[PDB]
Amino acid sequence: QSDSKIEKMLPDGGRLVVFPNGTRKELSADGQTVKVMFFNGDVKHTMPDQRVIYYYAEAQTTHITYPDGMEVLQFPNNQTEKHFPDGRKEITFPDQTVKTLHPDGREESVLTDGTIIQLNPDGSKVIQFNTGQREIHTADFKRREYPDGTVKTVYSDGRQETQYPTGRVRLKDPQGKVIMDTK
Amino acid sequence: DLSPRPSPNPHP
């Protein structure tokens, strides 16, 4: 592409190159370091330790690319995103929740208290608590699994099933009345 | 390349 380009020579032996589209590039004397100052205000610095650091002037965002392929974006609202080469993304929101988006469509958030929420691509959720309790939410019911082995399920029509650690199963109508009991 | 990268978007 570009032909109408201008180079100048730094006293240290580095080069400054100015391009007709406005882009400026600074190369060290060994050529090993490159600073690119784009016409739009963006800035790209390649590093000694090999990080590539890009600054988006309008969006006010920095974007680091690391040697293993990881990209890490730091947004003005103090939010950070890590993008991995298999397509996984890990978002750290301002309030320090971490959410991962996996390739398959799962999302997995970890809360400030260590509670884990997993959002499958079918719409169902799994919550896992510190206490050992799990909840499972599908479109038909919400199920709580307790550490003692008790499982309570509330269906979308308001019927509630308890399953006791022994295997006994009690089902109640919306009103609270037992309508089935496996003894 | 010489051209700026496209502006990026945070996740909602």
Which residue, A60, A67, A101, is CA-closest to A81? A101
Q: List CB contacts (< 8 A) between B1 and chain A.
A: none
Q: Residue with structure tokens 């945070």?
A: B10
DSSP string of A6-37? Answer: EEEE-TTS-EEEE-TTS-EEEE-TTS--EEEE
Residue in B2, B5, B8 closest to A21 by CB: B2
User: Cα distance from A85 to chain B (closest Cα, Å)?
Assistant: 17
Domain ranges (residues) in chain A = 1-183
Find out whether A155 and A141 touch, Cβ atoms under 8 Å.
yes
Residues making up chain A, counted from first to last: 183
Rounded Cα gap, residues A124 and A67, in angstroms: 37
Q: Which residues pair with A137 in a beta bridge?
A: A125, A142
φ/ψ of residue A169, rounded to 5: -125, 120
Phi-psi map region of A70: left, alpha, beta (phi>0 left; psi -120 to 50 alpha): beta
How many degrees, rounded to 5, is the angle at CA B7 between CA B4 and CA B11? 150
- Pair A35, A23: CB distance under 8 Å: no
The tokens of A5 are what?
């380009």
Question: What length is written for chain B?
Answer: 12
Method of elucidation: X-ray
Given CA atoms A24, A50, A63, B5 in this order, what sign does their dihedral have? positive
> How many degrees, rounded to 5, is the angle at CA A118 between CA A115 and CA A121?
165
Q: Which amino acid is at A4?
A: S
**CA–CA gap between residue A128 and residue A115 (Å, rounded):** 6
Point out the residue among B2, B8, B11 whose CB comes nearest to the CB of A59. B8
Residue A129 has which token pair?
Answer: 């608590």
| Residues A116, A119: Cα–Cα separation, whole Å | 10
Strands A116-119 and A169-172: unpaired
DSSP per residue, A142-155: EEEE-TTS-EEEEE
B 1-12 → A contacts, CB under 8 A: 2-5, 7-8, 10-11
Cβ–Cβ < 8 Å for A136, A153:
no
Give the 3-state secondary structure percentages of chain B, helix then strand then coil, rounded to 5. 0, 0, 100
- 8-state DSSP, B7: P
CATH code, residues A1-183: 2.60.450.20
What span, in angstroms and rounded, lies between the C-alpha atoms of A130 and A159?
Answer: 28
The structure was resolved to a resolution in Å of 2.2
Distance CA A9, CA A117 (A): 57
